[PDB]
Structure 1
């Protein structure tokens, strides 16, 4: 199956000038927990934003142009990205905006972090149809000394 994982600020903002302005260690821990030992698919802009391979995961990069780093796998289409994952139980799509839009129709599961932060962004998570999805898990956290915003971890499964 195909899953998307993302962290959304107010109004579905996910990025700004190819960066994520906030700093929520608890959410990066959740990201690692839910992606470790799975293949991760990302667009080239997100690969540049991260800046290095994510350890313990097969890193698959979508780009129309030839790859520039053999520590990761480069593919030229959505179907090639899926095939390069091989036979695994769960494929994790980790963005960004343009990649989320292409894989959302194929996804069975969404791992969403809702961050109570106002951010002026240039990239958004796609505007999906709420009736298509059932919330099967939600866990709210107040801000603390390490995490400056409150946040909610939610998992949604396609009905």
Structure 2
């Protein structure tokens, strides 16, 4: 199983402010929609409560509580380890989709990074790990919008 990771990071390193992403960069969400279409997303419970079960995605949610969901495209796991060993039974690719705790726990295990750098300096309290030294950028594209953003794909080597 291959692991990807997808995140939008602001210019000062903030990715979240409580339960919210503290910007709206028109167009950037299209990258997320395209890369996650019909994919398995591994998400922390807090991010799942904020985003909800959006259509055409499948979710592996990790929680240490009795948090549940009755949605047929959402699976609840008591640990990241159980999520990953179970996902390997069904799929060859999982996309780590946040939030801060899940990115920190999985960055050293992922194979491909999708990073959108957002030209804003917002307030917040959720951050992103340093990119491990064995990653190299392989594709980059800039976008002008209401808030500019740049998309970069990194591969582990």
Normalised TM-score (structure 2): 0.92
For the pair 1:23 / 2:24, whether they are aligned, the reply is yes
Which is helix-richer, 1 or 2? Answer: 1
Aligned to 1:64: 64
Aligned counterparts of 1:12 and 1:37: Cα–Cα separation in 2: 29
* Stretch moving more, 63-72 or 41-50: 63-72
Would you say the 8 A contact 1:66–1:74 is kept in 2?
no
Displacement, 1:128? 2.5
Aligned residues: CA RMSD: 1.2
Aligned to 1:13: 14
Displacement, 1:30? 0.6
Displacement, 1:32? 0.8
Number of aligned residue pairs: 153
Aligned counterparts of 1:59 and 1:88: Cα–Cα separation in 2: 12
Aligned to 2:121: 118
Displacement, 1:13? 0.8
Aligned to 1:142: 144
Aligned to 1:3: 4
Normalised TM-score (structure 1): 0.91
Displacement, 1:4? 0.6
Aligned to 2:109: 106
Displacement, 1:112? 0.4
Displacement, 1:88? 2.2
Aligned to 1:157: 155
Displaced runs of 4+ in structure 1, greater than 4 A?
Answer: none
Classify 1:10/1:78 alpha carbon distance in 2 versus 1 (closer, same or farther; 3 Å): same
Would you say the 8 A contact 2:63–2:77 is kept in 1?
yes
Structure 2: gaps spanning 5 or more residues: none
Aligned to 2:36: 35
Would you say the 8 A contact 1:101–1:126 is kept in 2?
yes
Q: What do the CA deviations read for 1:5-48 (whole angstroms, capped 9, x no partner)? A: 00000122100021012112311111010011110011011011
